Amino acid sequence: DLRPVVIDGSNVAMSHGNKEVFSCRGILLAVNWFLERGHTDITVFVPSWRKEQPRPDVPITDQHILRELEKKKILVFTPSRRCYDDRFIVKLAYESDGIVVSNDTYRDLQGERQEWKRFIEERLLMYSFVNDKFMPPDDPLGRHGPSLDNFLRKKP
């Protein structure tokens, strides 16, 4: 069936929030795009501190969505205290032979291990939002690669 999907929650929320707000509806729209397609294996990573009441440098909307998705077994909180996130995203996707949903290419992680660098190159699903419309590319790896349909499948 379908490759495990790992979503960079902070990337997708900042993107939906136009780079200025952590818009939690962005995570929900992404998740729903996959759910609609029949994906059942979906993990969103978000840092646990995003549950905390917001400070002026970290504005956030629709915070209730993090809990809703945690209850559904879709969101997993990464540990934080007074960052860890990118490594969880990459390691989980790598280890579950899945795909990462993010516009972050994780340059630091690429430089740690060649096989992570190669993974990121073959398994990253970038995207744009137009308002609430979540738009992944139909050919995620140009034409050196599969359609979006085959990209998300374990096999064509």
User: In which domain, by residue range, is 95 found?
Assistant: 1-156
- What CATH code is carried by the domain that includes residue 94? 3.40.50.11980
Structural domains in the chain (count) = 1
Take residue 136 and report the two structure tokens written for it: 């992944």
Residue 97 falls in which region: left (phi positive, over 0), alpha (psi -120 to 50) or beta: left
Resolution in A: 2.0
Answer yes or no: is 86 a known binding residue. yes
Contacts of 74 (CB under 8 A, 6+ apart): 31, 42, 43, 44
Task: List own/partner pairs for 27-35 with CB under 8 A and 24 or more apart.
Answer: 27/65, 27/66, 27/69, 27/75, 28/62, 28/65, 28/68, 28/69, 29/129, 29/132, 29/133, 29/134, 30/101, 30/127, 30/134, 31/7, 31/69, 31/74, 32/134, 33/134, 33/136, 34/5
